[PDB]
Amino acid sequence: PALTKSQTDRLEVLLNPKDESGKPFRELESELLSRRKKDLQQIYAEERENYLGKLEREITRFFVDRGFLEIKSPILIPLEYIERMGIDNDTELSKQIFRVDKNFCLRPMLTPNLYNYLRKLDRALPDPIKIFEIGPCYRKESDGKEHLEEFTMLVFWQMGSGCTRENLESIITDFLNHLGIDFKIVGGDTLDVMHGDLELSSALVGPIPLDREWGIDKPWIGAGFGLERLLKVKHDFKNIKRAARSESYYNGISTNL
């Protein structure tokens, strides 16, 4: 008989992107279970690194080496930062916020913390100011295929001298060629970094009117990238859930074996 849709769903959980119709479900399942167990055994025997942790470390090295200061700022942030980012009821993002208690939320972006860092560090560091952060961000989402409610963002941000669209495109290009991820840049000045139909990043050239609220009055360039989206593309995952912080997948391998 033909496989049921439920059975095909089960096999797809166990199917790996580079895996290469008369056998019963039971046999196809046993074969895939055996392969995935071996995949996990090989990781455990050899590298033992988590893809999301490893990518964070690789990205950190890239930016530290190119003169950007590594920031680790709060994940739980004041709700006032959302309003101050110009996120009112007119915008999509207002309905995407995870509130915590009466005064806090889970950050949906790194931007407000990093605005504060740029303003503070400008009192201490030589121009240009170059900073980056990688860490958890949270948004309520409808979509499942390219969106996670708990994801990981990289932002890099330069302020002062050399903040041109050309230099922004150069950093993006060097970065993605370093990772081995194909892309196209599609065009304050605003740029989208695409992999086919998937947005890997939004990038911007300042100044913009919002800067004044944060005490910023210098030119700047920066961009935000989703790490799970980078992993999805690099590893050819069909669904972004394979790249997420998860109890269901480890390095894109089902843990339900």
Ligand X SMILES: Nc1ncnc2c1ncn2[C@@H]1O[C@H](COP(=O)(O)OP(=O)(O)NP(=O)(O)O)[C@@H](O)[C@H]1O
Residue 111 interface partner, choices Mg ion, ligand 0A1, ligand X, none, CB cut-off 5-8 Å depending on type: ligand 0A1
Residue 195 sits in the site that holds ligand X (CB under 6 A): no
Closest to 232 in 3D by CA, of 51, 9, 32: 51
- Binding part of the chain for ligand X, among 4-12, 116-124, 145-153, 206-214 by CB under 6 A, reads 145-153
Cα-based distances in Å from 40 to 18, 60, 105, 208: 15, 26, 36, 48
Residue 165 sits in the site that holds a copy of itself (CB under 8 A): no
User: How far is it, in rounded angstroms, from Cα 199 to Cα 186?
Assistant: 10
Residue 112 sits in the site that holds ligand X (CB under 6 A): no
Pick the binder of ligand 0A1 from 62, 81, 105, 111 (CB under 6 A).
111
Residue 28 interface partner, choices a copy of itself, Mg ion, ligand X, none, CB cut-off 5-8 Å depending on type: none
Residue 139 sits in the site that holds ligand X (CB under 6 A): yes
Residue 200 sits in the site that holds ligand X (CB under 6 A): yes
- In the complex, minimum distance from the CB of residue 135 to ligand 0A1, in angstroms, rounded to a whole number: 12
23-47 b/e with 16+ CB inside 10 Å = b? eebeebbeebeeebeebeeebeeee
Pick the binder of a copy of itself from 149, 164, 185, 198 (CB under 8 A).
149
Q: Is 130 exposed, middle or buried (0-12, 13-18, 19+ CB in 10 A)?
A: buried
In the shown chain, the binding pattern of residues 62 to 101 toward a copy of itself, with x for contact by CB under 8 A and - for none, equals --x--xxxxxxxxxx---------------------xxxx
Pair of tokens at residue 66 = 């190119």
Residue 49 sits in the site that holds a copy of itself (CB under 8 A): yes
Closest to 245 in 3D by CA, of 224, 231, 225: 231
- In the complex, minimum distance from the CB of residue 68 to ligand 0A1, in angstroms, rounded to a whole number: 12
Residue 234 sits in the site that holds ligand X (CB under 6 A): no
Residue 157 interface partner, choices a copy of itself, ligand X, ligand 0A1, none, CB cut-off 5-8 Å depending on type: ligand 0A1
Residue 239 sits in the site that holds a copy of itself (CB under 8 A): no
DSSP 184-227: EEE--EEEEEEETTEEEEEEEES--GGGGGGT--S-EEEEEEEH
Interface residue list for ligand 0A1 (CB under 6 A) = 109, 111, 155, 157, 202-204, 222-224
